[PDB]
């Protein structure tokens, strides 16, 4: 620990540190394109959605807020960003 690099940390060890406490701070979250089968429609949902993101047409709750991440509904396609 005498001579090491802090400019270029190893990406695995840098992956475990807290969000605020990295080399350059930045979020650990992401977005999703989800599709309910009852509409075949892309809805964009944040991974930590604090409100119940309901689909556009149908009254189907695509995700529920529980602590950190939002629990997706059963039977829902998704993909990141």
């Amino acid at each position: 620990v005498l001579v090491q690099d802090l400019l270029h940390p190893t990406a695995a060890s840098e992956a475990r540190k807290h969000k605020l406490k990295t080399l350059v701070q930045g979020p650990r979250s992401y977005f999703l394109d989800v599709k309910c089968p009852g509409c075949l429609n892309i809805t964009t949902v944040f991974s930590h959605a604090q409100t119940a993101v309901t689909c556009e047409s149908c009254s189907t709750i695509l995700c529920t807020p529980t602590g950190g991440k939002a629990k997706l509904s059963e039977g829902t396609s998704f993909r990141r960003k």
Binding site: L2, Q4, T10
Partner: protein, 87 residues
Amino acid sequence: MENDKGQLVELYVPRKCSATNRIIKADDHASVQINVAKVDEEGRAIPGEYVTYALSGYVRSRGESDDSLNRLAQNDGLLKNVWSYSR
């Protein structure tokens, strides 16, 4: 230290450490001087030709002299694939 005549006026130049570059003093008995033997093409040690290292009593006492000597050896090409500069 010299005089105005430009001649040196000290008793001895101290040995400095190599891990932390600080002065190894005249009574640091927890410090250590390391000799590593220069090898031949056959893998025989040259008897009177060494590469030397200085690892001070603070360095050695703190529990760092292994890692620091690994660093110094791999940077001087005596190790390879041991000391990683990124952790």
